[PDB]
Ligand binder design. Structure first.
Ligand code: SF4
Ligand code: FES
Length: 312
């Protein structure tokens, strides 16, 4: 009844202090993740290249057949370690291009020069959503294979830093025409991935496929979260990889079990057809916008607080 995980977000550090895990503990987590069935491993955190053992960690992903994605800013010593990371079998690179930046270009040019698939990532909001054409030209200029533009904080999970920062319905309708025209314009050259607030949807989307249903986030100290923003929710018992095997955390840790399945649900989700399709929406949005994480996501039209959130 409990599904196998597919992705793993490894926050290796918060650097750009001394409480970070040892190399051997990360190598164990990667091994246990492959044993559970994880496919993708996102090497990130603050700056994953700041780790001295970043090459050995990347090599273990290749040794275990895990698809490694280096989520990095591309600044500082990131370019120095790129050649070694390529040699050990780094599968993919994701450069957050939010726009000093000259050295991001040198890192990006070297990634494509080695033949690695590059993905520019950028966070868009009401202020900088007019910059989407500039991001499209940059991705083509650098020769990236993919371009991500998302109003959410972390791609995959549906959570925002603030509500007033979100873009207009007019801006979303505008950013569809820009992205769709550029998709046809660059069918084979670039892949464009847009994530924006759905102002026409009556029902919400499953956040990361559902709580405790796909992804794991592992903090630098070894704390395992069902999502990046899960520490927002109070009363959750997170387990550490230093005290349990990853499989026991995925299946038995109270933080993962808390909002997994449908037994936790309040109305209207508890008596709803779509309860096992979107899983009540996003827990963190519910908490951040209603005060209780077990509430229905206000993004849903059946939420009683949808009338207030829509006016905001
Ligand atoms: S009510 Fe709960 S389950 Fe039914 S749609 Fe709205 S969110 Fe998804
Ligand atoms: S971000 Fe949607 S569940 Fe935590």
């Amino acid at each position: 009844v409990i599904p196998a995980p597919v992705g793993l977000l490894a926050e290796l550090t918060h650097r750009c202090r001394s409480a970070e895990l040892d190399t051997q503990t990360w190598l164990r987590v990667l091994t246990e993740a492959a044993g559970l069935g994880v496919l993708h491993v996102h090497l990130s955190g603050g700056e994953p290249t700041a780790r001295p053992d970043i090459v050995e960690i990347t090599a273990k992903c290749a040794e275990l057949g895990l698809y490694s994605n280096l989520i990095t800013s591309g600044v500082g010593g990131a370019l120095a370690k790129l050649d070694a990371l390529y040699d050990v079998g780094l599968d993919h690179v994701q450069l957050s291009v939010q726009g000093a930046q000259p050295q991001k270009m040198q890192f990006a040019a070297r990634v494509t020069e080695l033949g690695l698939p590059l993905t520019l990532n950028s966070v868009i909001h009401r202020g900088n959503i007019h910059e989407v054409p500039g991001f499209i030209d940059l991705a083509v200029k650098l020769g990236a294979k993919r371009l991500e533009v998302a109003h959410t904080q972390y791609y995959g999970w549906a959570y925002v830093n603030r509500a007033a920062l979100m873009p207009d319905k007019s801006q979303v309708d505008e950013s569809i025409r820009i992205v769709e025209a550029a998709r046809e314009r660059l069918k084979g050259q670039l892949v464009i991935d847009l994530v924006v607030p759905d102002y026409y949807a009556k029902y919400p989307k499953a956040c990361a496929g559902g709580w405790g249903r796909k992804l794991m986030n592992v903090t630098p100290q070894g704390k395992v979260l069902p999502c990046h923003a899960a520490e927002t929710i109070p009363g959750l018992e997170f387990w550490y990889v230093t005290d349990h095997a990853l499989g026991e955390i995925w299946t038995k840790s109270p933080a993962f079990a808390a909002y997994r399945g449908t037994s936790w649900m309040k109305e209207p989700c508890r008596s709803c057809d779509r309860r096992e399709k979107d899983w009540g929406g996003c827990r963190c949005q519910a908490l951040a916008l209603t005060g209780d994480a077990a509430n229905t996501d206000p993004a849903c039209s059946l939420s009683p607080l949808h009338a207030k959130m829509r006016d905001l």
